[PDB]
């Protein structure tokens, strides 16, 4: 329920430090942008296939809706 | 020396299994890290299983010069008894740094962090807090000695 009886953890050391000792944005770029590509590489490959076929399937409904508005030639007569 | 690293090795045992040294060393540990003041006095098992006698040679001969020793006795003692022992026995001890060298003391960083050692099987919990002192010749001292007078100490067997 409360901190305290939540779990039972042995032999597990944790190191902090200080935020004042340390910095807020230590190497924000130079180990942000590897992380974040890294992450775009492990999920792009899920979600892109599925939302270039909604654009697709977007563009062909547009498409075919203005063909379908364009005048038919068969009645020339 | 093997006989003695052995007694160090059970002694260290002994020593963790108590728990308010451990306590001790991880707060020295993580108060004074990246200085020498955060390694701990009986060191570690590897050094323990390491040192040999060429370096305990090097010590002796490095930290046991004359000026960084004090004789110091108390109560019946009779001082110029005490003094003219000391240039009998205990005179010319090394004198000589052997390459004109004498080591000195860096200043040591306070970071202020946490260690947390989590171990539910233990019946009881210790918890050490502190903050960076003055110093020993800082006139402070008597100061913060009065705080921690009033704060003060207690255990379960207080009668008050």
Known sequence: ?77 | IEKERDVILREMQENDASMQNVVFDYLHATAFQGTPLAQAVEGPSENVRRLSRTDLTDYLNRHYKAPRMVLAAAGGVEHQQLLDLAQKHLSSVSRVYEEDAVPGLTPCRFTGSEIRHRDDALPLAHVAIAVEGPGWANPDNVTLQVANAIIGHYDCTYGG
Do not use: C, D
């Not at chain 1, 974040?36 to 075919?64: K, S």
């Open chain 1, 1 to 77: 329920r409360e901190f305290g009886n939540l779990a039972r953890i042995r032999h597990v050391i944790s190191y902090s430090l200080s935020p004042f000792e340390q910095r807020a944005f230590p190497s924000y770029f130079s180990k942000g942008i590897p992380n974040v590509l890294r992450r775009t590489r492990e999920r792009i490959l899920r979600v892109a296939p599925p939302f270039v076929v909604v654009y697709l399937i977007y563009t062909w409904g547009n498409q075919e809706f203005e063909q379908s508005k364009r005048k038919n030639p068969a009645m020339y007569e």
